[PDB]
From Swiss-Prot, chain A:
GO BP, sorted A to Z: chromatin remodeling; DNA repair; regulation of DNA-templated transcription
Gene name, Swiss-Prot/TrEMBL: ARP5
Record's GO cellular component terms: cytoplasm; Ino80 complex; nucleus
GO molecular function: enzyme regulator activity
Protein name (Swiss-Prot/TrEMBL): Actin-related protein 5
Organism of this sequence: Saccharomyces cerevisiae (strain ATCC 204508 / S288c) (Baker's yeast)
Swiss-Prot record, chain D:
Residues carrying N6-lactoyllysine: K8, K54, K68
Post-translational modification: Demethylation is performed by JMJD6.
Protein localization: Nucleus; Chromosome
Entry similarity comment: Belongs to the histone H4 family.
Linked residues for Glycyl lysine isopeptide (Lys-Gly) (interchain with G-Cter in UFM1): K8
Biological process according to GO: nucleosome assembly
N6-butyryllysine, modified sites: K8, K21, K54, K56, K68
Keyword vocabulary terms for this entry: Acetylation, Chromosome, Citrullination, DNA-binding, Hydroxylation, Isopeptide bond, Methylation, Nucleosome core, Nucleus, Phosphoprotein, Ubl conjugation
Physiological role: Core component of nucleosome. Nucleosomes wrap and compact DNA into chromatin, limiting DNA accessibility to the cellular machineries which require DNA as a template. Histones thereby play a central role in transcription regulation, DNA repair, DNA replication and chromosomal stability. DNA accessibility is regulated via a complex set of post-translational modifications of histones, also called histone code, and nucleosome remodeling.
Organism: Xenopus laevis (African clawed frog)
Entry's Gene Ontology cellular component terms: nucleosome; nucleus
Phosphotyrosine: residues carrying this PTM: Y28, Y65
The protein's name: Histone H4
Curated annotation (Swiss-Prot), chain E:
Principal subcellular localization: nucleus
PTM annotation, UniProt: Monoubiquitinated by the RAD6/UBC2-BRE1 complex to form H2BK123ub1. H2BK123ub1 gives a specific tag for epigenetic transcriptional activation and is also prerequisite for H3K4me and H3K79me formation. H2BK123ub1 also modulates the formation of double-strand breaks during meiosis and is a prerequisite for DNA-damage checkpoint activation. Deubiquitination is performed by UBP8 in presence of SGF11.
One GO cellular component term: nucleus
Molecular function per GO: DNA binding; protein heterodimerization activity; structural constituent of chromatin
Gene field: HTB1
Source organism phylogeny: Eukaryota, Fungi, Dikarya, Ascomycota, Saccharomycotina
Modified residue annotations for N6,N6-dimethyllysine: K2
BP term (GO), one: negative regulation of transcription by RNA polymerase II
Protein name: Histone H2B.1
Localisation: Nucleus; Chromosome
From Swiss-Prot, chain F:
Main function: Probably involved in transcription regulation via its interaction with the INO80 complex, a chromatin remodeling complex. Also involved in the regulation of telomere length.
Residues of the full protein shown: 57 to 111 of 166
UniProt-recorded name of the protein: Chromatin-remodeling complex subunit IES6
Native organism: Saccharomyces cerevisiae (strain ATCC 204508 / S288c)
Misc. remarks from the entry: Present with 1720 molecules/cell in log phase SD medium.
Subunit description: Component of the chromatin-remodeling INO80 complex, at least composed of ARP4, ARP5, ARP8, RVB1, RVB2, TAF14, NHP10, IES1, IES3, IES4, IES6, ACT1, IES2, IES5 and INO80.
Subcellular compartments: Nucleus
Similarity comment text for this entry: Belongs to the IES6 family.
Amino acid sequence: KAVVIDDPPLRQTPEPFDEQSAYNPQSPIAIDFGSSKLRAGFVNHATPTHIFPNALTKFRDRKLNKNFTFVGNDTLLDQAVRSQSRSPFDGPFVTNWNLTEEILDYTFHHLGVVPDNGIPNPILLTERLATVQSQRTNWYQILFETYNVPGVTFGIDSLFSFYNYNPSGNKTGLVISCGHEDTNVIPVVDGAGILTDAKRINWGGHQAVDYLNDLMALKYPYFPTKMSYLQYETMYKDYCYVSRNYDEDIEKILTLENLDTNDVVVEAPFTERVAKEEEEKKLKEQQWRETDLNGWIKDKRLKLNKLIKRRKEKLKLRDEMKDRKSQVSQNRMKNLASLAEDNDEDWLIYTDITQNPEAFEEALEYEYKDIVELERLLLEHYDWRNSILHLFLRGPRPHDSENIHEQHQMHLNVERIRVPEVIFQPTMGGQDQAGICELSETILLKKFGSQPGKLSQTSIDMVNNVLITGGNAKVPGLKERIVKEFTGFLPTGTNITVNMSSDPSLDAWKGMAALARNEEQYRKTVISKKEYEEYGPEYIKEHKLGNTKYFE
Amino acid sequence: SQSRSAKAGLTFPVGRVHRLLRRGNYAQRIGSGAPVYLTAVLEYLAAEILELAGNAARDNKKTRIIPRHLQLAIRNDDELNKLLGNVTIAQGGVLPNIHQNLLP
Amino acid sequence: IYIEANTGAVKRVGRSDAYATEFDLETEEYVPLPKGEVHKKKEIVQDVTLHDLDVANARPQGGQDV
Amino acid sequence: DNIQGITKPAIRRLARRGGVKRISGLIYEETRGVLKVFLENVIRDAVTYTEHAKRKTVTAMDVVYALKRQGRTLYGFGG
Amino acid sequence: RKETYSSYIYKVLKQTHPDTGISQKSMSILNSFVNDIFERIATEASKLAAYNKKSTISAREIQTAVRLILPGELAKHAVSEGTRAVTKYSSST
Amino acid sequence: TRRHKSARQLISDENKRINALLTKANKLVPKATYFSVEAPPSIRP
């Protein structure tokens, strides 16, 4: 039975807002500006109070002639307002800042803030690794001008999650983050991110869902229904997993016994003398069939086999005549030039060398009628399991072309493990970059004073504290695969510890909350208004949780 | 230094067809891949015609290429006849064809 | 490769299958990795006769290769 | 019922516009065939013309210039 | 300096049929055939350049014109060989 | 009022600014830019 996918169900209750009585103008406020989701909430809580997608519609009413504005969870109310949602991001960067300003106004309204001449609370913000100068210039401009914020700090969400799971702030470990638009590997020494050795792969969840959409479009070119992005996201979330060993799983992914358990079928939603001699021959055949049915059936089966062999030989001859480079075409050209370079028999040969395109079809129809008569005489007295292509489209079951339900079915057999493999082999997605395990190997075995063969104490402490974060770590089998690769390339007896939280998409905001609750190391990262007015927007605050300067 | 025909791995010239495209007033601007694409197409067409002509000349057991062999190669082939169903030939002749009932 | 510590014998099993796609056609045979550990230890018992040592010390052409 | 969109009164009308009087009762299929090959030639040329123009709908301008390529030029729908 | 294609088709005949010669009337057949194909393809490419408000002829217009002129198997083999030649020429590094 | 400044030309003006600064410094060494963070191609086939 094929499961039916559709759009995700719409939200019913609208987004509420916090009471203005509990607001105080001195507590900090943490904002996780993500490419896929926004996470905001006050510092004194442990979980953020507002999680909604980063989206915005400019709703137009035909009757009231008024431009409306729906942000985030309020866009999850109508299908038309869901389909027209727009993001402020374009790739890994932000292009239009009016949308960001409107979204920030929306989330300031929903937090129950009563302001005066701007927001009095200092903000906590995340930023991309090695961000462009224009981005931090625009962020400084919009904050310190349109919102009058006293303090701003910038950091990477991976280091925030690492600080959340190592609150002492001086540990040594390795961070792997699988984000929406990129995947990063950052080594941490004594709580400070070594950004001269971080690496980035241009692949994320968005490229993975686009890859699945392209694979499904190329697999079924005559699919009558158009599928949306959210449906492909549901298929990516539900039936995709990381294989333990991709190099040998593809050899047995299309056998019949493996396809019994590892095949997913997805259903699209939809709404007189000759007559006397012939009669005597028929009577004699009926008497022979009543007298000896076994011998007559054997003779009819032999005649049907001879007719089938003749039809196969005729089809082989017709296929061989179609090849211009075949020896039959060369013999035809030799006979034709032999009638064009240098008797009744030669006349019959010239008559027999004529083209017979429709005569061959008529003879094939006559042979098919004769084979049908032979099958009827046998009754009176091509396997799809050997087709890899049939197993690739339609799985281990026979296919009915006339079934309306089978015309909307979609099978997922090779694509369950092919989609998540691109973060380990980026060449399959079109990026000429090394994989996750290759970058981790060249970090651990040839850097931080570690010759290949023996590990320094920094490398041992890095291996002992590996943390996996990011929203794209929801894929099953990721931790076991990374552990297997890591024990593959390391020396024997090395202790490997890999930590992954229950929800690896909310650890960054918990990192902001843990940094803001820790008062002592807060003040190394805050940037005042006077600081921005003195050293200008070209200013980078060097600290253990954020970016560094471009040069030395 | 060296010509563009060996740079693109061809025997037909590239600058010659670039020149002939230039003042042939087809357009006032001509890209760089235009002569190499035209050169490769002309390569393939001449090679195919020469293959079939050599096969017909060998089929005649005669060591030169005579336009009767060109006519045989043009009309024996299917889509070469379709491409050349308009052009009349010099000293080529007619392929032997007798309709079936004229044989007694 | 294959290295015996006590004797010093060296046997080349073949190229690893991680380098199988450096070329489309190659003379080299490709074998997978050992699933085992690199270091293996085992105790064995050897049984020889006096005639075996007699014929080992009395080779007249000379000591042949392995 | 795919090719059966065109029918007996339609090609009866077309043959009557050819000025014929007596038709045969099974001239149906070869007329359906030449119908099919004429359309697939014309819209194959139109599809190539609109493919090069990065226009993923087929316009009238493309098909009249496809006919003018084919030597059956039409007047009135552009040119 | 009367200009003709004689030497080039002499060599590409010579790489497959070494002991074969060409007559002069046949020599003229291949010369006229090459010039006719050149004229047809170039005027179709110019017509397709004037189609799209475009003042430049590039490889894409000639690929479309080759797909328009030739029959199908000749067309797919011609665009395959031409694409291989273009990628050979462009990666001259 | 700002221009749109899409994601393709942000890379262009960033590395042109980096190249301008480096050519000024030549007439110094980068530490952590957007192009040094990029992962190198792999060494295995």
